[PDB]
Amino acid sequence: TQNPMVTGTSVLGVKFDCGVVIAADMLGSYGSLARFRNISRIMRVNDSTMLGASGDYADFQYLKQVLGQMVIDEELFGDGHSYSPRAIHSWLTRAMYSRRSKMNPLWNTKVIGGYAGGESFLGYVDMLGVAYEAPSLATGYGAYLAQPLLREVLEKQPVLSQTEARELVERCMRVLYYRDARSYNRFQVATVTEKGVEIEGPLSAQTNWDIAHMIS
Amino acid sequence: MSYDRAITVFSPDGHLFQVEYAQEAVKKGSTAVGVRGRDIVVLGVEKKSVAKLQDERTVRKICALDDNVCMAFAVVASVSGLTADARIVINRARVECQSHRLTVGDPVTVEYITRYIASLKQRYTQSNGRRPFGISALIVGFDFDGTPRLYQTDPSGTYHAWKANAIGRGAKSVREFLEKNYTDDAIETDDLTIKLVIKALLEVVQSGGKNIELAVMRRDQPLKILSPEEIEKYVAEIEKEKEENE
Amino acid sequence: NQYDNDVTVWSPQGRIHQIEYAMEAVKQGSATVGLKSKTHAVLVALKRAQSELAAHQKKILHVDNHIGISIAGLTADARLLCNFMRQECLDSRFVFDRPLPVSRLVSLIGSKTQIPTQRYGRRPYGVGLLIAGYDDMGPHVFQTCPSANYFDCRAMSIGARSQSARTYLERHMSEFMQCNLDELVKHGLRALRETLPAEQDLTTKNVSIGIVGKDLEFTIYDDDDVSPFLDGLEERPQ
Amino acid sequence: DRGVNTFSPEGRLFQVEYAIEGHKLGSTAIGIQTSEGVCLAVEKRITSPLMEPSSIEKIVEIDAHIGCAMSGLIADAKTLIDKARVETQNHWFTYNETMTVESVTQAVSNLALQFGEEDADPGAMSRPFGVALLFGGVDEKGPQLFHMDPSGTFVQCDARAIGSASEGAQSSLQEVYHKSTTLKEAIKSSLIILKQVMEEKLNATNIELATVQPGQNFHMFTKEELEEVIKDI
Amino acid sequence: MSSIGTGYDLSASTFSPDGRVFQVEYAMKAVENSSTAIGIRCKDGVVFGVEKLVLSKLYEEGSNKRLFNVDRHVGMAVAGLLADARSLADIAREEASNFRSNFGYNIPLKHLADRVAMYVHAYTLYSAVRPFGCSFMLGSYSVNDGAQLYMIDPSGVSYGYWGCAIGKARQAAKTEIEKLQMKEMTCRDVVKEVAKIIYIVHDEVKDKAFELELSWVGELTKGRHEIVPKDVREEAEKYAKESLK
Amino acid sequence: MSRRYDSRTTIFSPEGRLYQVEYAMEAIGHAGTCLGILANDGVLLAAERRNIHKLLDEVFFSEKIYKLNEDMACSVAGITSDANVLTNELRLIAQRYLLQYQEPIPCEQLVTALCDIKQAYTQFGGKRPFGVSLLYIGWDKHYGFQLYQSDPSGNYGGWKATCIGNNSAAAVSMLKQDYKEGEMTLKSALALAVKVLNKTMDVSKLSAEKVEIATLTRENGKTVIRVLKQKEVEQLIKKHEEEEAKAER
Amino acid sequence: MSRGSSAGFDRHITIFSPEGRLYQVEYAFKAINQGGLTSVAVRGKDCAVIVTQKKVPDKLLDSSTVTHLFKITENIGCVMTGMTADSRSQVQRARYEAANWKYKYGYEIPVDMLCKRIADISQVYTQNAEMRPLGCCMILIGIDEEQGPQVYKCDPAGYYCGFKATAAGVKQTESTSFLEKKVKKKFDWTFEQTVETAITCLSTVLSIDFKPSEIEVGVVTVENPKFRILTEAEIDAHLVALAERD
Amino acid sequence: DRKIEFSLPDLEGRTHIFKIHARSMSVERDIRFELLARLCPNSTGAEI
Amino acid sequence: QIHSRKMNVSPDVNYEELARCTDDFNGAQCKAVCVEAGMIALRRGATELTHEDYMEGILEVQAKKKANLQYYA
Amino acid sequence: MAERGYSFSLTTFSPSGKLVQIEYALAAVAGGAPSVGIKAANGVVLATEKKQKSILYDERSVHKVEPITKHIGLVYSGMGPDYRVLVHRARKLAQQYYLVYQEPIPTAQLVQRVASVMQEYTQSGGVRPFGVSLLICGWNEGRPYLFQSDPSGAYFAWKATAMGKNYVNGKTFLEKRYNEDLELEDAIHTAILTLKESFEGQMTEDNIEVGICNEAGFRRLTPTEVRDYLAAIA
């Protein structure tokens, strides 16, 4: 059980899976330790025309992964005319890489969430710093996994999948809670959705504020 | 370059050119006979190619590769008395034998070195640029068990054990000759074992018994090369009995 | 003759003969049918034999228990690819952890078969392989031939006198998708009977059948385990 | 300078057609499969009774419980066996059950056509195997004997005889053996067939008999042990 | 004779008295045996149009492999020996793969074509492997230098074109492209244009019966190389049929 | 045969017997005579250098007789171009032996190390066979002064008098004939060396431009090897010369 | 016949012909005549100028995209002359060699060293048994920041010779002769002069005279710290000046 | 119309023709001819 | 095609499919093949030349012979 | 078969006993520019025909008498590529030598080491020999040196020799005119005459380069300096 002291972190990557789409929110803020150097930052990338990848935790470890997944995707599409890669092979091969790098004791964690459909099935895969792949109803990794995911679990517990409206209220609730409870981040989120044409998610914008407990 | 010229071409003969050809060399230069005895398996050579100003210590036609396995050879090719080809084969086979001891102990068996040597020429047939060695060695020895063995290898690299086998100056001829002399009595008696070797050599006798060099080797023990002087003692008496059969 | 002794000797046509001579081995070798529905992929094979004291040669091979191949041509070249393919599968579950797509493997072998046709004197592999597979996408019937060119086909038949089988597949292009596991197998027998004379039809002992699809994993059926599939005997014209 | 492989206009390798002719020159191998074992019988190809029948590499061990008999070019066979041997003993170490006789057969057939030199590969051969092999061993489904030949044709066999006349070796098998019958009789049938392809009449000296059973496993026979199985001609 | 078909091609370590080895000239002949692949360059992408020779109607997609995806902005339409077609696809692609990792950006076509061209000529030099003998085009839309179209022939010569066609009807086709406009106009207007050239050139002493395949690589597909949709393909084809008659 | 299946050493003979070696032996005969005679306080080597021309820079006195080690020297008969790689190789082996053994290296050991490289070149690796026979001269304390002969093929023998070069057959028999055993001294073996060298060679005059002479002499129990300089060489020639002159008309 | 002799190994694997020059190397020169690219390079004191046919056969080709001027260093430039297949392979090779060097030395490369170094690489191609020499000529332009503008040319095999004025192509002998008169009666150089002299000599030999979208003139001027392609805008200006000049 | 490669008599075909000649002259019957035919390579009818 | 006109046109022969199977057979050789195809057909009790009949004819006409050396042939 | 394959190869031996290949290499050098080298015994001179004719050659960084190290120069004939690799390796080896001893390499040790390298190509098969014959000059230890290394990979000691165009005639003049021990200035005069025998088309305003090696060291000389000697004796 591990968690390296991160320098340049993306704290949170939100994710809930729906019927043909995924809605992801990705933190705008890039903390480089305590100082927040860069907000503008979208951590969700476009690999290909039917895949997307969104990661939280170290951003450096992310940028190393985006080009590598780019060369793996480039080998696979060559074979067809418009064939696109399934989520599971790329995410699982990367899992084996992180299990090996975890054993090497000086390393930095990243945890990514891939959405793709390259099969006859829409796959939601995760590669973690610890490694494993699984399906999830609603997901959050890193700092989300620790504190909001449990709030999400609470919800998930009697009602297996939430509605659209209820996920939006939670998102709004959530950003408040992260700024308040975790440090590095900001309220500021980018809303990114991936679909069968590519990933679309414009620049991170400010959203609801409340670092007030003077009112509580 | 031509198809026939190339090292690759399996030929209508149904067997690779360079393997076939190495097999047609196992007569002429030097003669090596080895017979099996209970107490000594003995190899003898005739012709070390010595003018008797040339060192006999330098030329080994009977070299002990192990401490209970020894081998004697002969072969055909261009330029007489040719120490070189035989000499590389002694060097790789002897080191390998010492390396075997280090890995898995005690004196290494007759049959194992012979298996290694036959495969050594074989692997070369796959390997780049390499033809097999044209050599047949009469691997003579005792096992760690003490079970006497007499083994022979051929140029392709198929090996068989025999009770007694002879090569060189016409392989086929010396094999045939040795079969009249061999008896089950010959193997039991220590005097007869030496004479059986000498008896095959003599049908291409050259220059005394000082030319002919014999060794006895025992169960775990180093090669003992009998004096060039001792050999002469057997030849004078035997040579007379020899004339009569052929 | 002369072009194929080497490879670097190019022809006055502009096409290498070593590849063309390699295709003719495929004509010597066993007739095969490979067909797909859209849930299943069926390999219907003709077994040939050297002795009838010995069991007839299994022409469905396990590459993995989800893709299998049926071989037509040089057997030594076939087995060499069989092993190569087998390891690739093992590799794919080992790293990726899933059932290997047929599509990733035909392309990978297609890259590898090109290399010795270009290497000086070396063969193009004188074997045509029909890979029948059901992966996550659904069924694929793939052709690799001695040319590194591969086809994605719905149904094709390769091997000795398979041409006669191909004509019946064209009539029944429509029927394939529509067909069940049982039905698709009866068409493979129909296609397979064309290969053989108008004096005779199929027997249990010269037919090997390999089924992979939605219903069950890759199982190979031998000498008399073919029987429940087998029943269905259709027209052979003169 | 030149290539390696040469296809004939007939549509098949020249070197592979030559490799078949290669088989006709050598020893003979008969293997007979029973559900009580697989026996392999081969001649050394005698010319003197001084040649021991006690320990001669014609039947060699791939594994502790798999024996392999060769025909054709004898020498070259020992290299095929060595490659199969390394694969088989690693599998035996790992599994501690049995190493499929069928896999081993499939593996060797890869070595038949692979060969390159002259600006291809230094690690690959300059020749085709003109070896045909009978791998007879004991496996978890049962005792199995597989036949491989220079073309690379892996086929499963209940009973197969291959020799210096391929047509001859099998035809004698038709007369004498039938698939199902005792272990003792399977050996009996190997020897009769072996004598038929061979020039000369059967003796203890001319052959080596090795039986692989699930009950005894591979046994390499020595001269006292040879006399026992000879009794049944 | 300007070529000998036995003598000076016994090894790939040869030259010939004119200055060019005969094996390379034969390699242009190999491309003649197959049908034509045309690709016309816009400034908003490239559009390919290849005619694919068919023998059966049990063929489905990913058959013959006339269109390859070299990258997520590089397209390839090929002509000639399909066997040879797979290795050239590998060579371009591997160069692309290393490039993507290290450099971290979209490849400029000006660099790729010369870089690949070196490799195509490099097999010809060697006698470890024989010359190539399929011809290909690279067509890319990038922000790196815009839309660019190159053609690399099995000799290893790389040249710029707004319109190139490689086949056995390459000479007749290239002239035909020059009469039409496509240089400045969008991929959507162009697709129609690539199809018609193939039908008009289409002879019965240089080609056989074909099914049309066309391909995008431009702004509409958002960089990436995809095959044109069936609906769109059939309108581009419908003009192609009308234009011949 | 009716055609060689050689044209490379990555392909081999149509008999499996290597013709190239017999042409190599002929190559020593083309080149000038090399002879070694034994002495009872040294060993000396006499060789005919490639250079006969008047114009010699003469910075080297070693151009066919190379001193390798602090115990051994060798000579070349054959192609000069071949020695240069060999001589540097021999230096490495010779010092390599000392490092482990630290003994006055025996002549039989140095020669066997070299024979490994020559036999491999002929078998594979695509390298052309050698065309030099080298004569190794050295001292060990276990048999004495020794002379060994190495052949292009890897064929070796210990001698105490041997000659190769300018028809080998004649030369070895002649060198033996004039050699005596246990009657010798270094000055007289040297005077004799020129005389025999004169007879095998076409010249009846011979000079230090034509010839290069080396001694290996053991002093105070250690072997000092020098290849001699021209004025010293001339003195051995003039000693011989008076006798040669009487033969002549 | 032709230069060299077919007999023996010299086209199967690269081993010298009787001439002592490789069979492939003598043939290697002939490869320029195959190309049809005729170049003359003239050296100023303010710039080094190269003028070559760009070989655009039709305006269907894009004049910009087609090139034969390459940027092989940070401001060293070259032009390719001869068989195009050879020419791209040489360009890419030169580029690797160029980058490595720039780093090591740590500053931009002398024109002389770059030509010398490619000349060493091309010998490698000659010597190796699989490969064959390059059939092309690289004409490098650049201004050394000591000596001044230098024009070098490397031959197909990898011959190197110094040049202050050079020509290469089909009509190599004729182009060098027109330039030889101009070198003798040396004008004082400026951007315009040097360019005018290069084009004029190439236009006498061919006797057509160039179009302003069919040649590519490449300069390394003191005003640019980059390698620059003149393009149609600049060339058109020099071309109308030629007719009028004399 | 056709090309046929003319090949030497197979193993059954040579045994059969020898049998016919063998009976005519004085031979010991149980004949070792079969053992020799199988051992040896392809042998023509003239040869037997 | 031209040869099928000479004899008869069966539903079974498909020219496109046939071309793939075989390699390097010219006109003269082909005529011999069509004559051979007919030989097969007469044995069957047919007048039709089947697709299988054309194929088989190809093998008899060359150097190739029944009962091949190869163990896949 | 015939003689063609056997004799040419250096993957196997010539049946002549000496290799027909090195002889081929000398012919190459004959087709090259004419080069003379003479050790005076007051210094060494290397002179060669260098093609200017209008000054078409950069003589500011590229030459035909070229320094390996401080006091060693080489002048060459024959194949141009073969030489360029030979120069670069030779300087590399020299620099390793200057690094270790702290003395620039002498000609006599250098030729022997250089010969080992050229022998490797004369041994290796598929690899042809270096087709340059080198004239190495030097002044080290207080003594001038001139050596000849031929394409075989052998080194020979000469006081004066000739290469390039009509070498047979060069060697004959050298023996005839040359005397042991002379002045370096008189020595250049006979070297320019040695070239003049088989120059071809004769010298223009300057169409030769000479480099001198002496007590102060090896220096290639400038076109002006070179011209002064040519007036004295053409």
Side-chain angles (χ1 to χ4, degrees), chain C residues 203-232:
Chain C
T203 314
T204 190
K205 181 54 176 283
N206 39 67
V207 162
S208 212
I209 303 193
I211 296 311
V212 59
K214 287 187 73 202
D215 301 324
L216 53 157
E217 304 197 296
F218 221 110
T219 37
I220 62 160
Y221 302 96
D222 305 280
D223 286 337
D224 303 88
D225 309 276
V226 295
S227 313
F229 305 95
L230 201 56
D231 299 315

Short mmCIF file of all heavy atoms in Angstrom, two decimals, chain C residues 203-232:
data_model
loop_
_atom_site.label_atom_id
_atom_site.label_comp_id
_atom_site.label_asym_id
_atom_site.label_seq_id
_atom_site.Cartn_x
_atom_site.Cartn_y
_atom_site.Cartn_z
N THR C 203 -16.80 -39.20 -46.11
CA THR C 203 -16.95 -40.22 -45.08
C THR C 203 -16.47 -39.52 -43.76
O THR C 203 -15.67 -38.56 -43.78
CB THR C 203 -16.15 -41.43 -45.37
OG1 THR C 203 -16.24 -41.87 -46.67
CG2 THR C 203 -16.70 -42.65 -44.48
N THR C 204 -16.93 -40.06 -42.62
CA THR C 204 -16.65 -39.67 -41.27
C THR C 204 -15.21 -39.60 -40.93
O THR C 204 -14.85 -38.83 -40.05
CB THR C 204 -17.55 -40.61 -40.33
OG1 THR C 204 -17.51 -40.14 -39.00
CG2 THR C 204 -17.06 -42.04 -40.41
N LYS C 205 -14.39 -40.44 -41.52
CA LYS C 205 -12.97 -40.76 -41.24
C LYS C 205 -12.03 -39.83 -42.00
O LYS C 205 -10.99 -39.54 -41.54
CB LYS C 205 -12.58 -42.24 -41.59
CG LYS C 205 -11.18 -42.73 -41.33
CD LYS C 205 -10.82 -42.47 -39.86
CE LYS C 205 -9.40 -43.08 -39.54
NZ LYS C 205 -9.39 -44.51 -39.36
N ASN C 206 -12.50 -39.23 -43.15
CA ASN C 206 -11.70 -38.26 -43.85
C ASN C 206 -12.16 -36.89 -43.52
O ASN C 206 -11.62 -35.96 -44.03
CB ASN C 206 -11.54 -38.46 -45.37
CG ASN C 206 -12.81 -38.95 -46.07
OD1 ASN C 206 -13.78 -38.18 -46.13
ND2 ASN C 206 -12.78 -40.18 -46.73
N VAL C 207 -13.14 -36.70 -42.64
CA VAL C 207 -13.57 -35.36 -42.26
C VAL C 207 -13.22 -35.15 -40.83
O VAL C 207 -13.40 -36.00 -39.94
CB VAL C 207 -15.08 -35.32 -42.44
CG1 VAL C 207 -15.65 -34.13 -41.66
CG2 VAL C 207 -15.51 -35.32 -43.93
N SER C 208 -12.66 -33.89 -40.63
CA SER C 208 -12.25 -33.29 -39.37
C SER C 208 -13.05 -32.03 -39.40
O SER C 208 -13.19 -31.42 -40.46
CB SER C 208 -10.71 -32.86 -39.26
OG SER C 208 -10.30 -33.00 -37.91
N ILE C 209 -13.62 -31.68 -38.22
CA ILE C 209 -14.46 -30.54 -38.06
C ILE C 209 -13.97 -29.80 -36.80
O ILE C 209 -13.75 -30.46 -35.76
CB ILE C 209 -16.00 -30.88 -37.91
CG1 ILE C 209 -16.46 -31.70 -39.15
CG2 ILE C 209 -16.89 -29.57 -37.86
CD1 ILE C 209 -17.98 -31.89 -39.42
N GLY C 210 -13.91 -28.45 -37.00
CA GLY C 210 -13.56 -27.53 -35.88
C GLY C 210 -14.55 -26.45 -35.71
O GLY C 210 -14.88 -25.70 -36.59
N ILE C 211 -15.11 -26.34 -34.51
CA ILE C 211 -16.20 -25.37 -34.26
C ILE C 211 -15.72 -24.43 -33.16
O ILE C 211 -15.37 -25.00 -32.12
CB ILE C 211 -17.44 -26.02 -33.67
CG1 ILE C 211 -18.16 -27.04 -34.53
CG2 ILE C 211 -18.52 -24.99 -33.08
CD1 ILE C 211 -18.43 -26.55 -35.91
N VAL C 212 -15.81 -23.09 -33.45
CA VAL C 212 -15.69 -22.05 -32.40
C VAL C 212 -16.78 -21.03 -32.75
O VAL C 212 -17.12 -20.86 -33.92
CB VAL C 212 -14.36 -21.26 -32.21
CG1 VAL C 212 -14.03 -20.50 -33.54
CG2 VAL C 212 -14.39 -20.52 -30.84
N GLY C 213 -17.41 -20.39 -31.75
CA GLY C 213 -18.49 -19.45 -32.04
C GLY C 213 -18.94 -19.05 -30.69
O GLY C 213 -18.30 -19.30 -29.67
N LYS C 214 -20.10 -18.47 -30.66
CA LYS C 214 -20.78 -18.13 -29.49
C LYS C 214 -21.16 -19.29 -28.63
O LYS C 214 -20.99 -19.24 -27.38
CB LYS C 214 -22.09 -17.37 -29.70
CG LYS C 214 -21.92 -15.91 -30.14
CD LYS C 214 -23.28 -15.20 -30.15
CE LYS C 214 -23.91 -14.87 -28.77
NZ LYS C 214 -25.41 -14.68 -28.81
N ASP C 215 -21.58 -20.42 -29.14
CA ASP C 215 -22.08 -21.53 -28.41
C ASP C 215 -21.02 -22.28 -27.63
O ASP C 215 -21.16 -22.61 -26.48
CB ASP C 215 -22.88 -22.47 -29.27
CG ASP C 215 -24.04 -21.71 -29.86
OD1 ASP C 215 -24.61 -20.84 -29.18
OD2 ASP C 215 -24.40 -22.02 -31.07
N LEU C 216 -19.80 -22.47 -28.18
CA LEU C 216 -18.84 -23.18 -27.47
C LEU C 216 -17.45 -22.75 -28.05
O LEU C 216 -17.35 -22.25 -29.15
CB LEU C 216 -18.90 -24.75 -27.49
CG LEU C 216 -18.96 -25.41 -28.91
CD1 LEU C 216 -18.46 -26.86 -28.85
CD2 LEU C 216 -20.36 -25.39 -29.62
N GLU C 217 -16.36 -22.95 -27.16
CA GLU C 217 -15.00 -22.64 -27.37
C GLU C 217 -14.44 -23.50 -28.43
O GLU C 217 -15.15 -24.33 -28.98
CB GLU C 217 -14.15 -22.74 -26.05
CG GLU C 217 -14.66 -21.89 -24.91
CD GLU C 217 -13.60 -21.74 -23.87
OE1 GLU C 217 -13.13 -22.69 -23.22
OE2 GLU C 217 -13.07 -20.58 -23.86
N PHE C 218 -13.17 -23.33 -28.77
CA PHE C 218 -12.61 -24.09 -29.81
C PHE C 218 -12.31 -25.47 -29.32
O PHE C 218 -11.55 -25.78 -28.37
CB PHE C 218 -11.31 -23.55 -30.39
CG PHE C 218 -11.15 -23.62 -31.91
CD1 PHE C 218 -11.17 -22.52 -32.69
CD2 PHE C 218 -11.19 -24.92 -32.58
CE1 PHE C 218 -11.38 -22.61 -34.05
CE2 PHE C 218 -11.43 -25.00 -33.99
CZ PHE C 218 -11.53 -23.86 -34.68
N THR C 219 -12.97 -26.42 -30.01
CA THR C 219 -12.90 -27.87 -29.81
C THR C 219 -12.66 -28.29 -31.17
O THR C 219 -13.30 -27.83 -32.10
CB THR C 219 -14.26 -28.42 -29.33
OG1 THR C 219 -15.34 -27.71 -29.96
CG2 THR C 219 -14.49 -28.14 -27.80
N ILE C 220 -11.77 -29.32 -31.29
CA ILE C 220 -11.42 -29.93 -32.52
C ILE C 220 -12.11 -31.30 -32.47
O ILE C 220 -12.04 -32.00 -31.47
CB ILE C 220 -9.93 -30.05 -32.76
CG1 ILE C 220 -9.11 -30.93 -31.75
CG2 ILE C 220 -9.34 -28.59 -32.80
CD1 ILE C 220 -7.74 -31.39 -32.33
N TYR C 221 -12.83 -31.83 -33.52
CA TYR C 221 -13.45 -33.13 -33.66
C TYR C 221 -12.63 -33.98 -34.66
O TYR C 221 -12.28 -33.54 -35.73
CB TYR C 221 -14.93 -33.08 -34.08
CG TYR C 221 -15.67 -32.31 -33.10
CD1 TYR C 221 -15.94 -30.95 -33.31
CD2 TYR C 221 -15.88 -32.84 -31.79
CE1 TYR C 221 -16.47 -30.22 -32.28
CE2 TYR C 221 -16.49 -32.08 -30.83
CZ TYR C 221 -16.79 -30.71 -31.03
OH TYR C 221 -17.48 -29.77 -30.15
N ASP C 222 -12.28 -35.18 -34.19
CA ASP C 222 -11.34 -36.13 -34.79
C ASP C 222 -12.05 -37.00 -35.72
O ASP C 222 -12.74 -36.48 -36.59
CB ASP C 222 -10.41 -36.85 -33.73
CG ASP C 222 -9.73 -35.83 -32.97
OD1 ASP C 222 -8.69 -35.19 -33.39
OD2 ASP C 222 -10.34 -35.52 -31.86
N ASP C 223 -11.75 -38.28 -35.63
CA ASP C 223 -12.09 -39.33 -36.52
C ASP C 223 -13.57 -39.74 -36.49
O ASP C 223 -14.15 -39.85 -37.57
CB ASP C 223 -11.23 -40.62 -36.27
CG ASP C 223 -9.76 -40.59 -36.74
OD1 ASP C 223 -9.50 -39.78 -37.65
OD2 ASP C 223 -8.88 -41.15 -36.13
N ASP C 224 -14.22 -39.98 -35.33
CA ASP C 224 -15.59 -40.34 -35.33
C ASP C 224 -16.31 -39.52 -34.28
O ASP C 224 -17.41 -39.84 -33.79
CB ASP C 224 -15.90 -41.85 -35.05
CG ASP C 224 -15.21 -42.76 -36.04
OD1 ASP C 224 -14.02 -43.16 -35.80
OD2 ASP C 224 -15.89 -43.08 -37.06
N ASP C 225 -15.78 -38.28 -33.93
CA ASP C 225 -16.45 -37.37 -33.00
C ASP C 225 -17.15 -36.24 -33.81
O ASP C 225 -17.94 -35.39 -33.35
CB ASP C 225 -15.38 -36.69 -32.17
CG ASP C 225 -14.44 -37.72 -31.55
OD1 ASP C 225 -14.85 -38.26 -30.43
OD2 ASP C 225 -13.30 -37.95 -32.06
N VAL C 226 -16.92 -36.37 -35.15
CA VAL C 226 -17.49 -35.52 -36.17
C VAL C 226 -18.95 -35.77 -36.43
O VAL C 226 -19.60 -34.81 -36.87
CB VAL C 226 -16.77 -35.43 -37.43
CG1 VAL C 226 -15.39 -34.76 -37.24
CG2 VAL C 226 -16.61 -36.85 -38.09
N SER C 227 -19.44 -36.97 -36.10
CA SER C 227 -20.73 -37.45 -36.43
C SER C 227 -21.98 -36.64 -36.17
O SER C 227 -22.73 -36.64 -37.17
CB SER C 227 -20.86 -38.90 -35.85
OG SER C 227 -19.69 -39.72 -36.19
N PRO C 228 -22.31 -35.99 -35.04
CA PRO C 228 -23.56 -35.25 -34.83
C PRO C 228 -23.72 -33.99 -35.85
O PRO C 228 -24.81 -33.53 -36.17
CB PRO C 228 -23.40 -34.60 -33.42
CG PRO C 228 -22.62 -35.69 -32.70
CD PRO C 228 -21.60 -36.23 -33.77
N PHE C 229 -22.54 -33.43 -36.26
CA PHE C 229 -22.33 -32.33 -37.16
C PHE C 229 -22.61 -32.78 -38.59
O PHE C 229 -23.05 -31.96 -39.45
CB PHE C 229 -20.83 -31.73 -37.08
CG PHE C 229 -20.48 -31.32 -35.66
CD1 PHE C 229 -19.80 -32.19 -34.81
CD2 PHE C 229 -21.13 -30.19 -35.13
CE1 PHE C 229 -19.71 -31.94 -33.39
CE2 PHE C 229 -20.88 -29.84 -33.79
CZ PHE C 229 -20.10 -30.67 -32.95
N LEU C 230 -22.13 -34.09 -38.87
CA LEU C 230 -21.89 -34.67 -40.14
C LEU C 230 -23.14 -34.85 -40.95
O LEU C 230 -23.11 -34.69 -42.23
CB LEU C 230 -21.18 -35.98 -39.90
CG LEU C 230 -20.32 -36.72 -40.99
CD1 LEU C 230 -19.19 -35.89 -41.61
CD2 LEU C 230 -19.86 -38.03 -40.29
N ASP C 231 -24.21 -35.29 -40.25
CA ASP C 231 -25.42 -35.64 -40.92
C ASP C 231 -26.03 -34.44 -41.68
O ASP C 231 -26.40 -33.38 -41.07
CB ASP C 231 -26.53 -36.00 -39.97
CG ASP C 231 -26.14 -37.20 -39.12
OD1 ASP C 231 -25.60 -38.21 -39.66
OD2 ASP C 231 -26.38 -37.18 -37.92
N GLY C 232 -26.08 -34.64 -43.07
CA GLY C 232 -26.48 -33.74 -44.06
C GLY C 232 -25.67 -34.01 -45.26
O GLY C 232 -24.50 -33.80 -45.26
#
